[PDB]
Amino acid sequence: FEIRELAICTVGRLSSMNPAFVMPFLRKMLIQILTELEHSGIGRIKEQSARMLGHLVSNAPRLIRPYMEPILKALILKLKDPNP
Amino acid sequence: WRMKDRMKTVSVALVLCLNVGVDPPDVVKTTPCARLECWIDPLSMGPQKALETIGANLQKQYENWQPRARYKQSLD
């Protein structure tokens, strides 16, 4: 999982150099992370998904800025759910 | 890299065995089923009128890609 975090951080860091190859792949990974958070009822998986989402937010603001609303809505829905 | 030959689609044949208003015996469709053929609802404007309209619309759709072709429609 840590290698995944480092890789996604590196890829998001490269989103400005080669947007054409990175932005679509990062959009797909964002979709996968979001559905993981929404559907997987596992603490470890959801925690890893949230960590990957945070790394993606930190490293690729430009890709996520159009998608700020759904990500925020999903995080809010997660917050309203009844692991630290 | 040279093009060996330039072929042209002179004519287009549009056979539409839609059979408006009658369901084929093989498939029993659901009550809603699928009613959009070439973005036209057959049941709204009557069987023959819908068949002709769908044929004309499909001819227009093909003309959108190949305007220069002879289009002859066969309806059932």
Binding site: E36, H39, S40, G41 | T30
Partner: protein, 176 residues
């Protein structure tokens, strides 16, 4: 219970594809009955409902959400109930096909929990769930990243039984 349900299933089988007419009459009552049933009748009712869905194929869409809700409510650690629900899942996916991807995420947590903890002898429940995942087909494209790591851990764990890891490898190969 068993008498009337067997009669209903036999009539639906005999009618063939014309049995769709009786869906509005039977489906809501059947779902309510399965909801309010108790004891060993539950698994038999789920099996007969699977047979009914197999007969009905694409016309079971309106009641599919309620069927999924019932399955989620009544899915427990019991081996027999899990097996019956897996068979019902296989019949559902072979009935619907493309549209099953809509209802798959609801069922995903139960499969994930089964993969996480399965004390069945030989992990036969896990093997049957692997077969169901094989039958899933193209509907798993939007959720492969979720189901795959459980199977990966399944066929990579040395402690897992050999037939279970063989089933996992076959499932991955088929999904490929």
């Amino acid at each position: 219970h068993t008498m009337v349900v067997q009669a209903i299933t036999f009539i639906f089988k005999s009618l063939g594809l014309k049995c769709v007419q009786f869906l509005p009459q039977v489906m809501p009552t059947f779902l309510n009955v399965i909801r309010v049933c108790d004891g060993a009748i539950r698994e038999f009712l789920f099996q007969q409902l699977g047979m009914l869905v197999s007969f009905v194929k694409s016309h079971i869409r309106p009641y599919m959400d309620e069927i999924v809700t019932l399955m989620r409510e009544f899915w427990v650690m019991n081996t027999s109930i899990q097996s019956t629900i897996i068979l019902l899942i296989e019949q559902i996916v072979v009935a619907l096909g493309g549209e099953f991807k809509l209802y798959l995420p609801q069922l995903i947590p139960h499969m994930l929990r089964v993969f996480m903890h399965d004390n069945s002898p030989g992990r036969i429940v896990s093997i049957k769930l692997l077969a169901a995942i094989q039958l899933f087909g193209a509907n798993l494209d939007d959720y492969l990243h979720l189901l795959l790591p459980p199977i990966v851990k399944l066929f990579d764990a040395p402690e897992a039984p050999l037939p279970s890891r063989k089933a996992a490898l076959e499932t991955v190969d088929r999904l490929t």
